């Protein structure tokens, strides 16, 4: 459940078990606002239970009115947090098929509003729903959502309840200033069984021998470990040693084969951000819940793209348009998604001589596009001779898809005079042609070099073609 | 070695290329040459000839709207100069030199409709007087020289 648009990036509550909706709404409200009259809040919980007892999960206006008679205001805002506890279902229990999920804490950085009540309720849900299997709850930057001794009493009571019910807590947080600054983490360290020094990053030291009780050699090793080898040190009970994950290990079938370094399915573990974005977007647009039924072909596509290039996206062609209502299918910054055009071919000629103030060469200028979307506007501009106010087109060779275009050409008062259309039994993608005249060329040919250099400034041919020689 | 490639460079006024070769340091470079001579006045039915205008295909120069302004204005460049060496070495004998006088651009190609995805530009020209210097273009590197010429007028 990462950071996204205002869809369900969280999970809500049932909010109406009439023997426990009081306590659920009480804990949800105090963790949502964290500041009240401290008098008859159970009457507020019962009144909002009776108000939401119409069917379920009414509007935010009705919820805030039944709660009053800053949490109400920020629930009326709902800036980027559609996955709150009100007016929604529990998306975590819609993952009851595969109860494996996790949260981007970019919204849960903002305690108390977005951070506390969703996480506390979902921890209540997963801890009270003892499915009999193992349970795992992982943390990083624990102290920003957890600023109350409510979590310390939770770790004392319900965590010790689920400790006999196969629950584990995996606090892989940052530098130990975060843990030493929270006495909740001190109580947790008094119950944390094993300790993994995963790295020696930029991190505060020499209180790291306090509480953990490292020896001088042990502290020397955990400082001399480093962070780029991605090996670790492990302490449990009272003992410790250096360890790793064998990132250099590989399939040694006969005598030691190709070093694959177990890199297949490590991209799940590595999670490279543009490939993570591609796989996440294709999965999220593919299906809401995400079973691995389309994921292996996405892994093969990610492997093929990563072996090809890292975010190259071609960078070879740029030929795009905007003529009135139509626009480009541009991978450049100009347009998007609509219409591509084919290529660049036309010129002008002169047959005369002054060397034994030019010659009149009655010519038209033409262009070929692919299959259109804005057919009838072009049809009207073609039949009526309507001049569009401009016809802009972008041309750029290889050397980058977001570079300055090699020719930017805007023709002026573009009356339309002929369009070839077509079609066939083999017409997978019809191309069409406009052959036309206008008032003025505005050619902007940039003499851009191969390496991205644009020496010198672009040369313009911005002249009337309609009844005049063009300088 | 360096390979097997012909060596051709040309200057026509301040028109210049983006080429980066050893003898083509921002020179105009071409991919095709197209002109032949003809004289229809021959008995099979001084300089009375059929009209023959010159043409070529060149790589992209940095001064193309200047050439289009030269076309629409009637501006000629006073001289075009070519050097073409046979394949076998870039720094071999200059197997051909060409000098063109009163070089007015007749036509340009390649930009507009969707016919050529990345192809080099045909440019055609006219003239007043052209002269060549031919060194013997045997399929070799260092080979005997001595220019054999013609110089000829539009008349």
Author numbering:
A (entry chain D): 496 to 529, 534 to 568, 584 to 870, 876 to 990
B (entry chain E): 826 to 870, 876 to 985
Can you provide the manuscript's text about this entry?
Here we present a single-particle cryo-EM structure of a T4SS complex from the R388 plasmid that comprises all four sub-complexes: OMCC, stalk, arches and IMC. Three ATPases, VirB4 (also known as TrwK), VirB11 (also known as TrwD) and VirD4, power the system.
Of note, a minority of the 2D classes in our cryo-EM data set displayed the typical side-views of the double-barrelled architecture observed in the NSEM structure, indicating the presence of a small number of double-barrelled particles.
